Scaffold this active site. Structure first.
Site, short mmCIF file in Angstrom:
data_model
loop_
_atom_site.label_atom_id
_atom_site.label_comp_id
_atom_site.label_asym_id
_atom_site.label_seq_id
_atom_site.Cartn_x
_atom_site.Cartn_y
_atom_site.Cartn_z
N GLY A 78 0.69 -1.38 0.07
CA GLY A 78 -0.11 -0.06 0.18
C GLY A 78 0.86 1.19 0.03
N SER A 79 0.09 2.41 0.21
CA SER A 79 0.63 3.70 -0.21
C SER A 79 1.88 4.21 1.05
CB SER A 79 -0.37 4.87 -0.51
OG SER A 79 -1.21 4.70 0.50
N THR A 80 1.69 3.39 2.15
CA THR A 80 3.06 3.65 3.03
C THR A 80 4.23 3.65 2.32
OG1 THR A 80 1.59 2.72 4.81
CG2 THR A 80 4.08 2.75 5.27
N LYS A 114 5.33 4.64 -0.26
CA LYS A 114 5.77 5.69 -0.95
C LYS A 114 7.15 6.43 -0.18
CE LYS A 114 2.20 8.53 -0.64
NZ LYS A 114 1.50 7.60 -0.05
N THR A 128 -3.03 3.18 1.92
CA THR A 128 -3.82 2.43 1.43
C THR A 128 -3.74 1.40 0.37
OG1 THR A 128 -4.87 3.69 -0.02
CG2 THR A 128 -5.87 3.87 2.32
#
Ligand SMILES: [Cl-]
Ligand SMILES: [Cl-]
Ligand SMILES: [Cl-]
Length: 477
Positions: free
Chosen positions: A226-228, A230, A425
């Site tokens: 998920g976008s963690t 990044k 997410t």
């Protein structure tokens, strides 16, 4: 015949131990036969609250002799025919469901067990660490088994389990500088004391028919992170030189695609904001900014950075796991897949334990620290996975998630503690999973990796995690 060793936590508190109980049970040779036996079993079942099927399953195990005391349930005054009481030793799990998938449970020896290895009256670990360490725990039929001391902290494990309240998800809590697994939680869970000692067919089938799969060890299962993720994409762009932290990118709207060849696919973000630098993109969770930076660095620079993390690697840990993967093939063969991997989607598969390992670079100046579960294991590291500058730039930016009043984790702000965090997410073919990473930046003593599955129904990781964060700031500090 040897006593089974204990599994204990980092302070010596029991996780898998032996305890004597006074049991009510039956003696086969005194139970009768035919319909008479069926009556005596029904009498027992009525009076002590156990299913006829469970009594018969226990009666029909291979060790059972005519004169055996067969324990059924913990103890009376009016014993039906064939019934007796007796003290018997049982395997016992003090944390119960909170550590069930990690610790596992024991069971009686089968013929198939005998066929590959053992007395018919002993026990053997069926799952989890009871199985993984079974040889060391079981001793020698004498020589009692060894005690195995884990990195787990029982108090953290219990608090980390409690936040879920039956929601599917997982939580991994580490000491990020040493690698200790302080807690490995998976939800929903099951009762390992019943699995080891006595469970009705109804109860077992309730667990197996639970579509949320409580037997699965979610902390060892691969997910898109998920976008963690990044955070890692940003560190890689910093080190590659293509991502400049103070550059202000113009980004308009809630969706973006490179050009029309993407068709109906778009990177999306939740809030309109422009211009966007690295710090605001991390605190806003701006997927578009990271999609653009991933295309800017290109596949070669992006994979060169990803390849320093532990993708492909089997770990020395006694928890079985598939090595993490970047994508299904060696090349993305798709600009969309390249971009989507930049914000933690695509074909990335990383277990929660592997995720917590990869994110350890942000508290070790760019060094990655491998996880460990046995307390006396030597700490192991992978040096210079990202630069110290990149690690500390990202970690400082993530303080804004907690400290900015518009940060997604401002609910956890504590003026007396330095906590960095990153929510995220993942959208799966649809359902969403929700993530929270936090980093103790006051003393670098804990890192948390929390996930809630199907967050459209179950809410976000941040929605349930504040008691765990509060507990850690007071306890692990
Ligand atoms: Cl549960
Ligand atoms: Cl270990
Ligand atoms: Cl955040």
């Amino acid at each position: 015949n040897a006593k089974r060793g204990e599994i204990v936590d980092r302070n010596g508190s029991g996780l898998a131990i032996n305890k004597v109980f006074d049991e009510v049970g039956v003696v086969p040779g005194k139970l009768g036969s035919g319909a008479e036996k069926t009556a005596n079993i029904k009498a027992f079942s009525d009076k002590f609250g156990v299913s006829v099927d469970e009594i018969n399953q226990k009666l029909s195990q291979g060790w059972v002799q005519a004169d055996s005391f067969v324990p059924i349930t913990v103890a009376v005054t009016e014993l039906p025919t064939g019934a007796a009481t007796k003290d018997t030793e049982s395997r016992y799990y003090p944390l119960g469901e909170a550590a069930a998938q990690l610790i596992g449970y024991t069971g009686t020896i089968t013929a198939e067990d005998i066929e590959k290895n053992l007395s018919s009256t002993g026990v053997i670990g069926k799952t989890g660490l009871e199985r993984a360490f079974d040889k060391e725990l079981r001793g020698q039929d004498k020589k009692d088994g060894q005690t195995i001391k884990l990195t787990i902290d029982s108090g953290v494990q219990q608090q980390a389990f409690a936040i879920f309240d039956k929601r599917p998800g997982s939580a991994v809590i580490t000491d990020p500088q040493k690698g200790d697994l302080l807690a490995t939680v998976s939800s929903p869970s099951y009762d390992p004391n019943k699995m080891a000692n006595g469970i009705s067919q109804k109860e077992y089938d309730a667990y197996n028919n639970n579509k949320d799969l409580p037997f699965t060890a979610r902390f060892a299962t691969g997910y898109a992170p998920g976008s963690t993720f990044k955070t890692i994409t940003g560190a890689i762009g910093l080190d590659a030189g293509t991502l400049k932290p103070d550059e202000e990118l113009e980004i308009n709207g809630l969706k973006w695609q490179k050009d029309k060849s993407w068709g109906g696919y778009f990177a999306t973000r939740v809030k309109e904001a422009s211009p966007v630098n690295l710090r605001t993109a991390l605190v806003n969770s701006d997927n578009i900014y990271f999609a653009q930076q991933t295309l800017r660095m290109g596949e070669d620079k992006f994979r060169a950075g990803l390849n320093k993390f532990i993708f492909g690697e089997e770990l020395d840990l006694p928890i079985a796991m598939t090595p993490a993967q970047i994508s299904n093939e060696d090349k993305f063969n798709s600009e969309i897949l390249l971009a989507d991997t930049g914000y933690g989607q695509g074909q990335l598969l990383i277990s929660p334990i592997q995720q917590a390992t990869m994110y350890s670079v942000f508290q070790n100046n760019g060094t990655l620290v491998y996880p460990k579960l046995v307390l006396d294991k030597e700490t192991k590291k992978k040096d210079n996975v990202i630069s110290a500058n990149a690690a500390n730039t990202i970690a400082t930016d993530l303080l804004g998630s907690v400290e900015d009043p518009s940060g997604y984790v401002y609910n956890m702000y504590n003026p007396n503690f330095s906590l960095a965090a990153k929510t995220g997410t993942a959208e799966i073919k649809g359902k969403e999973n929700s993530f929270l990473l936090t980093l103790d930046r006051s003393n670098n003593k804990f890192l948390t990796m929390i996930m809630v599955e199907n967050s459209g129904e179950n809410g976000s990781a941040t929605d349930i995690s504040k008691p765990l964060i509060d507990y850690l700031e007071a306890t692990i500090k």
